[PDB]
Amino acid sequence: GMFTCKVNEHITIRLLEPKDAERLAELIIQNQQRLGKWLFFAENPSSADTYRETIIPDWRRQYADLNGIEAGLLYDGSLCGMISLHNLDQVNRKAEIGYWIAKEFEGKGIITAACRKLITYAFEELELNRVAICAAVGNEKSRAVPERIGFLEEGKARDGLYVNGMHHDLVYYSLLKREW
Amino acid sequence: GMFTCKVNEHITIRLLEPKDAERLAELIIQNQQRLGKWLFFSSADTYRETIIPDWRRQYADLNGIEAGLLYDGSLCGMISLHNLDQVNRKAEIGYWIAKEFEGKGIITAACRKLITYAFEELELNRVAICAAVGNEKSRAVPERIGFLEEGKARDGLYVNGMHHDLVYYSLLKREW
Amino acid sequence: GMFTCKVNEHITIRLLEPKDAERLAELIIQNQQRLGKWLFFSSADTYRETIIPDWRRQYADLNGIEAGLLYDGSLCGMISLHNLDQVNRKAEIGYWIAKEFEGKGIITAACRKLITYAFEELELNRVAICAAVGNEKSRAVPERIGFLEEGKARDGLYVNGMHHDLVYYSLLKREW
Amino acid sequence: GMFTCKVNEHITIRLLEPKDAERLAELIIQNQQRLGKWLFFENPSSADTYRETIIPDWRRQYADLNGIEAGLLYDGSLCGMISLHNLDQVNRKAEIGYWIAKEFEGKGIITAACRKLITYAFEELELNRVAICAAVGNEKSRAVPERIGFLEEGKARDGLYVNGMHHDLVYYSLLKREW
Amino acid sequence: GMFTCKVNEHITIRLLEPKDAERLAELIIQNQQRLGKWLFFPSSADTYRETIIPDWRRQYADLNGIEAGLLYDGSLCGMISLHNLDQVNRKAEIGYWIAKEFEGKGIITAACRKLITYAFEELELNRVAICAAVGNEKSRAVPERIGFLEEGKARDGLYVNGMHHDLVYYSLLKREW
Amino acid sequence: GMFTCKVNEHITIRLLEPKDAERLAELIIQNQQRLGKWLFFAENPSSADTYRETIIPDWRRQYADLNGIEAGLLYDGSLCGMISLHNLDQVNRKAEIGYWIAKEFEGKGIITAACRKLITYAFEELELNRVAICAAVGNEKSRAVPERIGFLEEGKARDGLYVNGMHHDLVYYSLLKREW
Numbered sequence A, F: 001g002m003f004t005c006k007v008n009e010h011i012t013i014r015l016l017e018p019k020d021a022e023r024l025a026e027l028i029i030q031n032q033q034r035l036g037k038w039l040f041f042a043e044n045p046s047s048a049d050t051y052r053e054t055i056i057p058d059w060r061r062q063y064a065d066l067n068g069i070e071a072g073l074l075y076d077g078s079l080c081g082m083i084s085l086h087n088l089d090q091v092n093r094k095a096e097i098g099y100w101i102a103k104e105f106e107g108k109g110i111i112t113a114a115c116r117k118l119i120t121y122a123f124e125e126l127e128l129n130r131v132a133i134c135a136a137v138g139n140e141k142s143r144a145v146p147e148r149i150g151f152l153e154e155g156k157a158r159d160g161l162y163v164n165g166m167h168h169d170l171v172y173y174s175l176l177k178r179e180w
Numbered sequence B, C: 001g002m003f004t005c006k007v008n009e010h011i012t013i014r015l016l017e018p019k020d021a022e023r024l025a026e027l028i029i030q031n032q033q034r035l036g037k038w039l040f041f042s043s044a045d046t047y048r049e050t051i052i053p054d055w056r057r058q059y060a061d062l063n064g065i066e067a068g069l070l071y072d073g074s075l076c077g078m079i080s081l082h083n084l085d086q087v088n089r090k091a092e093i094g095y096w097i098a099k100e101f102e103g104k105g106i107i108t109a110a111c112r113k114l115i116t117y118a119f120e121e122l123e124l125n126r127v128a129i130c131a132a133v134g135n136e137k138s139r140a141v142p143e144r145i146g147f148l149e150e151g152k153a154r155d156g157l158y159v160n161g162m163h164h165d166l167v168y169y170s171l172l173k174r175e176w
Numbered sequence D: 001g002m003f004t005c006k007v008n009e010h011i012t013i014r015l016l017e018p019k020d021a022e023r024l025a026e027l028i029i030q031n032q033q034r035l036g037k038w039l040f041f042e043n044p045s046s047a048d049t050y051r052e053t054i055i056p057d058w059r060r061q062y063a064d065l066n067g068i069e070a071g072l073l074y075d076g077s078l079c080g081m082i083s084l085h086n087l088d089q090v091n092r093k094a095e096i097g098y099w100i101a102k103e104f105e106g107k108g109i110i111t112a113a114c115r116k117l118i119t120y121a122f123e124e125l126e127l128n129r130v131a132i133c134a135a136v137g138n139e140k141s142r143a144v145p146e147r148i149g150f151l152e153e154g155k156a157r158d159g160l161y162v163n164g165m166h167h168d169l170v171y172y173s174l175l176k177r178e179w
Numbered sequence E: 001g002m003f004t005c006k007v008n009e010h011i012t013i014r015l016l017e018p019k020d021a022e023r024l025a026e027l028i029i030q031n032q033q034r035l036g037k038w039l040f041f042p043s044s045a046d047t048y049r050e051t052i053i054p055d056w057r058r059q060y061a062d063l064n065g066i067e068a069g070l071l072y073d074g075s076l077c078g079m080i081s082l083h084n085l086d087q088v089n090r091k092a093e094i095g096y097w098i099a100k101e102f103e104g105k106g107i108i109t110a111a112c113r114k115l116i117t118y119a120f121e122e123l124e125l126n127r128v129a130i131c132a133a134v135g136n137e138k139s140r141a142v143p144e145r146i147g148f149l150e151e152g153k154a155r156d157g158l159y160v161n162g163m164h165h166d167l168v169y170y171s172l173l174k175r176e177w
């Protein structure tokens, strides 16, 4: 990585590249039954070849054009999962954050730390005013993230998700620049 | 229009076209300092050359409809289905109408047709409407129709300099 | 469809959609023959991802309309306004329909609507219909509507290894 | 011009470049309307728009292989355009059009350039049919197809809008088994 | 072809066309790699007809470079290109290769010369450069016959089947004309 | 910037963004009657709109597409120049480096320091074999950069540069990944 984001001496964020195709792909299979509650939706497989030629390239192109960041999470130099800034709406000065992490790395404080830099990035660099995270109401290591950083529940989206044939509610949390 | 959507008499819905440009801009200037609370917000050339055509390509590519409203054959506003998300089987609906035509019950009837389309044609499960918190006129729409208030986005809107909260309403395909 | 053209209680003309891909291909195969005599060109895939997407985009950009014909609700064929030439204020109209439905006077009634569009909305001065010099059922159409024969295109067609001539018919605004 | 079409010691045909802009805008205005009849079209556009849009678009079209929009060069310089359009591959046919300045009339330029274009059409493209149409009252173009061996096919009623009005178009086709 | 560059009575240069795709693929397969040294180093008719040839054409339409075929007695014996065009710096490079079957007939030299006049007279560049693997006699000789001067070496400029070789560079200045 | 390259405590490298256009354009008008010896010619120089709408966006896509870097040099926070890796030839495993700096920032070793990070990346990530740098023959300050890091002079380009009306020679320099 020429351009990189050091979160701490253990956590690193960087934009994927095509050569990241294999690990991501494999890294999404090793956890292929679960990873849908964390608003992504890999109930039906990654491909590696698809990631190499289309998804990652599209992701970079998007970073190039400035609508968001689809990035990889790194712990001791290995892809553990991904973090993301999306639904960027400059006029309204806001974006949302998503993320997910391989089970093995659950519990080391990765996502929470990665979100913090990403939050700092969002408020100081993009001069955004609001950042939101959402998570399936249902159970959450994921809701736990906005709650240690200090977001506020603001609402629910009834049937906001459609994972594995099932309808779930989505709960919204938001954090304002002045509160941060 | 070859292709059109009759809501009832007086009220027809249709994609815009380059030639709608001079009037769309006129209609937007006479209302400039309002559409924003209505979640929208101009050089009538830009619409002809860039914005109307983009809205059209976007409809051709199937993600959303940005359409014009017509009262008795004239453009009096817009209605719109955006944030289409086929994976979560949900979308959202926005709208705005020129003062001139307020109170004749257009938006409501227009949304009713749009929701129908969302629900039996795109087979969406969820439809939301979103309104700045202080604008009773828009909120009145989800409310007569039967949506349920779902939450707020703190600081959701940035209208001419200030912060305002947005409030969401939703309708499920089964409550319909 | 949000946006249709209702010809008349049986017949609606409407844009095609990717999801028409499966029926559209079943309907061309069961008619792989007969169809180049009505001057028309693969898989439910190529239609789903490439052909219809471009027709729609063409419509969004304003050159012509490649629409489906719908009898009592389902696709029975397609009607077309092509070679739009604005400067010269003219265009052509082609069309085809599945055998299943050849008796219902669909093509003619659709054509009649599209003609109205060409002259009243597109403000065109001229519309032409073209046909294989030997397709009596095609030739009938312009003729019944009142088009004049203008001439022939020598070898204008190449249908399966062989070539056949094309006959032109035209209709001027001040006649319709 | 690296790649070129030598009609004869006198006439050459070749793609235009952006640098040809100045002299195409200029050669056309020298002659405001004498053009919509010649089936171009008026309100003559500038050198910039020819240099940055029209000529590049013509070249890309040639690269993709549908049609030629080429400049006509009479002994060194730009005296007109000839072109191959409505190239219909499934029906194996195209249409040829052209125009030259009032200054180059008489020298058989169009006729000569057409021939090569046609020859290309029939054995390279392997097209079956080549057509030319022209305004009924525009003997100058008409003499061309009649000179080469095309047959009058029909007239399109009101097929042209030169300036303000409408005139009819007369058609001429030339099949392959036939030249 | 409508548009053609006539080098001489036996040699013509022209843009390739999709239909040229089967012949280029074969011409390359039966030569193969002894062309990696030329500066070419595979893929099919299919890839040539639907991607490589079109990009080539499109780049000719855009006025950046020429990728053309060499024709000996109406037939494709190889290619020549004007690449790395740099209009601001008034310079370009020229490359080529022909099939063995057609070696020794003076084709490459002949087309280079034509290509050169054009680089100098019509595009009005000041500089023209050519390069070649340090040990590719056949290729190095063209520039020297024409009167290009060796300008320098690019260390490890080539990569031919896992080995790296040096590139030697020759330039020719307009006034040296 | 989220993703950057910390060269050292004062010098950072980053992809430029549309909002850097005003500063880039001004820096370019400010110099420019050099900037030719430096091998970066606008010729018909900047225009803050053009860099914002076209030039900076394309550079960003190139970075996404993975074929080069057009980055900004920041001293203590702000643009003082650009570094660049271009002519990326993955097949021959080689590429070239360019860079320019504003006069007021001359002589602090920004370029050298930044080229080393760039090289590192070139040799240990794109895994290139060769890296070159070229410069105007009489551009002592530029020439100094390669020679200080230990490249070797490889040859000359006769009239390779064309500055303000006239021609000058380009001299080439190259570093082979096995000399590191």
Ligand SMILES: [Cl-]
Binding pocket: A107, A108, A109, A110, A111, A112, A145
């Ligand atoms: Cl965590």
Ligand SMILES: [Cl-]
Binding pocket: B103, B104, B105, B106, B107, B108, B109
């Ligand atoms: Cl209302």
Ligand SMILES: [Cl-]
Binding pocket: C102, C103, C104, C105, C106, C107, C108, C109
């Ligand atoms: Cl019928």
Ligand SMILES: [Cl-]
Binding pocket: D106, D107, D108, D109, D110, D111, D112
């Ligand atoms: Cl003549």
Ligand SMILES: [Cl-]
Binding pocket: E104, E105, E106, E107, E108, E109, E110
């Ligand atoms: Cl030789």
Ligand SMILES: [Cl-]
Binding pocket: F107, F108, F109, F110, F111, F112, F113, F145
């Ligand atoms: Cl330095």
